[PDB]
Amino acid sequence: SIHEVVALIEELYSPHPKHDVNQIQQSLQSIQKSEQGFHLANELLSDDKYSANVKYFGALTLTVQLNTLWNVFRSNLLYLTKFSTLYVSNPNMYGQSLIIIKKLMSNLSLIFTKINDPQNMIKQWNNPINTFIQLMSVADQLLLDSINCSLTYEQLSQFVSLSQKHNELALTFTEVIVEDLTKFQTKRHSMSQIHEVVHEHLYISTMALINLNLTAQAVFNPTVFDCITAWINYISLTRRMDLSEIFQNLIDLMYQSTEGSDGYENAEKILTIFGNVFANDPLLMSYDLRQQIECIFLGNSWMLQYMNYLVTNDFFSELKELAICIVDFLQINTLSVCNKLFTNIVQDEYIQEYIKVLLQMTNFPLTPVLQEFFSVRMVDFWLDLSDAYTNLASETLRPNSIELSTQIFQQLINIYLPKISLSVKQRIIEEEGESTSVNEFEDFRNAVSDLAQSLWSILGNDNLTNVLIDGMGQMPAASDETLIIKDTDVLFRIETMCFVLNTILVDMTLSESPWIKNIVDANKFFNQNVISVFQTGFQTSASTKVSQILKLDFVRTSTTLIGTLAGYFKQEPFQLNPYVEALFQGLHTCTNFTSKNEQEKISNDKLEVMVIKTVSTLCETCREELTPYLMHFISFLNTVIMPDSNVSHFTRTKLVRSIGYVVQCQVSNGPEEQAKYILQLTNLLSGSIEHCLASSVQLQEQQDYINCLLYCISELATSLIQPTELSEFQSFWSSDPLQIRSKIMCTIDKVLDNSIYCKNSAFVEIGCLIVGKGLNLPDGEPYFLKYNMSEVMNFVLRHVPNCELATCLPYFVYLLEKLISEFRKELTPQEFDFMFEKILLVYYDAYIINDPDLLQMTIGFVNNVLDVKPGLAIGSKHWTSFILPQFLKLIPSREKFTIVAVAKFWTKLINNKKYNQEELTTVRQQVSSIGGDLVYQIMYGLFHTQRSDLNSYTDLLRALVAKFPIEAREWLVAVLPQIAGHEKFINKLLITRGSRAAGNVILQWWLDCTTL
Amino acid sequence: SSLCLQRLQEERKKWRKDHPFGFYAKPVKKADGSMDLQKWEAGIPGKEGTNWAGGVYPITVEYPNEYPSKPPKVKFPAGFYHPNVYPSGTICLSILNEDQDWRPAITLKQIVLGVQDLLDSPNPNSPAQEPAWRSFSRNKAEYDKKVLLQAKQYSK
């Protein structure tokens, strides 16, 4: 059958095999490990005529050793035997035979991990490297015994390095052992002492071998670099292991590695090692070696020569790795530079040149992302330096601290401002298109924006903000009319200045500041240049995808800065007019146009959203200043609401919200002048709704149009609410002679009287939102849409029978809860019985009792009545007949929200503090009657339930025991035995507690009562 | 505590070094301009090709003193519309619940990717918001329209 085994092994690796690959694989997994699998593996490795894949399968079959103590020794002997076999066949001249070499190395590494774990005998290995060393010297089977645990010195170890493959095999063996010890330590932490064994024997041999490869020129092999990183990783996981001389000699090799000497290959690998150290465990390197790294990177200098070698050859990935390593190295040094700079606790001219070179490196020619990442990683460094300077003590500053800090950070501003220039993104989209480099450029801009937000606490307004304002306010960007810049250089400069100025001005308050009025009035072209950016970008024809995306970016930045300036517009109204006119000119250009080719419309919608967003912010803050523009806008809206427009329903809604924001502040001329606008908007919305419902029989388009106009009514109702920041309006809106509520209610009735709309959940939702807009508002607020009790009641009674009871009832019920909380003073238990009978009880037994949403809806309604006015629920005719029996049977319910609803119901019923003295006596009397069945339902649910619902009737039992401790024992001695004798134990232990630590007694009772 | 601040510093370094495109995160500033390491501001971009596309939804992350023994609390703005967002804004997510899949080793990157995945793939087992879950389950068209308008609402 050995011929059959070799047959299907070669069949598995054939290009197009027969029968099946999965089946011959399962059969190969079936031959092993069984008592002949081990002997098969030894015959597969000892036979030289087999293929390399078959021998690999032999070592893999050996790997299954998890199947007790004796077969491990019998395996390890043959592991080391076939080991020494192929490892002697390698060093002379074999080649490409090291695959099985690595697999056998992995098998021995697994053996070293398994044997040294906690669990005639067999002692510990302690040092497999030495054992491998003496195994290359060929009474025969007796040799492995004495060679294993004790071996030679360092001179013979260097003599082993007579060949290159010897050093390569030793580096790989130590590397695989270390990476496997790393994988085994990361998987599960039961090691704790094997690390000590590696520290006492393997660590010494590995350190001596690595240092021999680093110091000696002939013994040097690049594989040691990949081995060093492995050792460093394992050390980073445990903790004293020195590694100081290894880092020192790696620095010496990197400095000796030049273009002519090494071709910067060793320098690249050693820099990858240092980048790994600094990025993962930077504390692993001592202070002296980090000082040498500082003197090598910052200095003609060797570092400048390596950077020029990487730049001239167009190696952007290797330059990226270099920037990552240098930044991770510089981020750990902050307090020493900050102290020798800004705190006083020959060095000055040295640290001035130090910062000068660091700023020259911060600038760094070659545009970003596309080529370099130095500025991208340096942003986090400058953030740490800004926070470190801000975190410095007030009494510790240097005499020249503020001047040197201002100078350094202003040079930073002058360096990073051309870096984030939009010309870079233009060249990125030109060369690389829509790649991930654009996304990295957006993350770079967000990082520099946060850098400026942290730098403002140092530079102030005049050194950071006034530099941008005077840069863009004292010179016209467009001398010709229509504000066309015509110039690319100043356009990129002004887009950069608008972006930085916006992110700085968002953190301010333009109302409390008179400084903003002083700085803008000293700049004639400031507002003109901001509008020049908006109009230049908006009127830009999108030819390529690059010009389209840049157009969207310019519009985004402009609309955001305009949105940030509303406080200054309240402080300086006469500069507001050019903005409103320029905005509405662009706003009409992106509204009345229907040209779509083809995905351009998503850019039109993004522009239209940012414009209407800026309009919403301005109407939110500058309500008083915008009074004269109202009469033109309502007419333009009348032209937009036409069943043919380019606006989205969202833009229609936010437009109605903006007009309502301006209308809310028109309380000056009295309620009549403001009501002229309110009645005009009411007649326009209801007229267009009634026009659409009764003319073009409602289709999906008419449904979206009706939903849009209903949302417009909702935004208008929200916008007319007085912000939290006389009697004539109260009497007017209490009477509302213009019949605003009458027209709105009849319009909602006309929409909900249609069968295509009343059974839709969305229209019921927005209807109950609009009708319940005036509910729960602070009393005294002259709200226009404040509805009385009877109007909302007859409204719900009007549209509740003809609607869909499954999906549409909770909105009417939430509206009734709002009405109950509003009219809590004037409510009567008979009116509450009327609402309970008409809206819930008739529809209960058919549509509610078997529906979880409607069930939890009804329970939450009763809980709302108990929270607001308990006298309505207690004095109900269905209180003792319906509410109590039903909620009693619903205690061991299967729905989580239903369980929580019933538990909150009985909990509020017990712990309610709003009870009258008569109501409290009647409640205690009724509870002292049903309490029995209550404990039965509690233990019934607790028995049939499982974890995560145990704490539900715990708070119910906590309230029942605290409120009724005496009857608690009488009800427990009756309910416990039904749901054996050990149950009595909870009685003494629970009532003794009172409350606050039950459950702990309860699960200790459930544990008893479950096994039985 | 003191493990808490050391861990949050390491998290800040790790995030700032490597994170998904379109996210941002930064400690809020205290009155003295120093960072409140236990309260962060972040932004979650909607996934392209979903009704969430185009929005960047802002969240706050509040780390308890017992972090990382206890998970942070993550909140959207009050009134955010989603079936797994409480009225308060509290997100229902297994990795954010100490009683479920929270592990001390979970990083901010994993949290924010979890939130992104939750955005277009709500979990029915955590219905934190009645109207969102109801619309999702009974009027998908309304839910999608609301999501699209909220994406416009929080436009990038």
Numbering used by the authors:
A (entry chain A): 3 to 69, 78 to 129, 137 to 155, 162 to 262, 269 to 328, 343 to 388, 396 to 775, 786 to 1039, ...
B (entry chain B): 2 to 157
Relevant lines from the article:
S. cerevisiae Pdr6/Kap122 was originally identified as a pleiotropic drug–resistance protein and subsequently as an importin β superfamily member. Furthermore, we found that Pdr6 imports Ubc9, exports eIF5A, and thus, combines functions of Imp13 and Xpo4. Pdr6 is an all α-helical protein built of 19 canonical HEAT repeats followed by three helices (termed HEAT 20) at its very C-terminal region. The transport signals recognized by Pdr6 are folded domains.
Diffracting Ubc9-bound Pdr6 crystals were obtained from a complex comprising full-length S. cerevisiae Ubc9 and Pdr6 proteins. Pdr6 binds Ubc9 in an open superhelix conformation. In the import complex, Pdr6 adopts an open conformation where the distance between the tip of HEAT 20 and the loop between HEATs 4 and 5 is ∼25 Å. Ubc9 is bound to the inner surface of the superhelix with HEATs 6–18 of Pdr6 engaging in extensive interactions with Ubc9. The first interaction interface is formed by residues of HEATs 6–9 and involves mostly salt bridges. Several aspartic acid residues of Pdr6 at this region (D370, D429, D433, D436, D492, and D499) form a negatively charged patch, shielding the conserved basic residues at the helix α1, as well as the following loop and two β-strands of Ubc9. The second set of interactions involves HEATs 11–18 of Pdr6. Helices α4 and α3 of Ubc9 pack against HEATs 12–15 and HEATs 16–17, respectively. Overall, Pdr6 buries 1,473 Å2 of the Ubc9 surface area. Our structure of the Ubc9•Pdr6 import complex revealed that Pdr6 is transporting Ubc9 in an inhibited state with blocked interaction sites for the E1 SUMO-activating enzyme with SUMO E3 ligases and SUMOylation substrates.
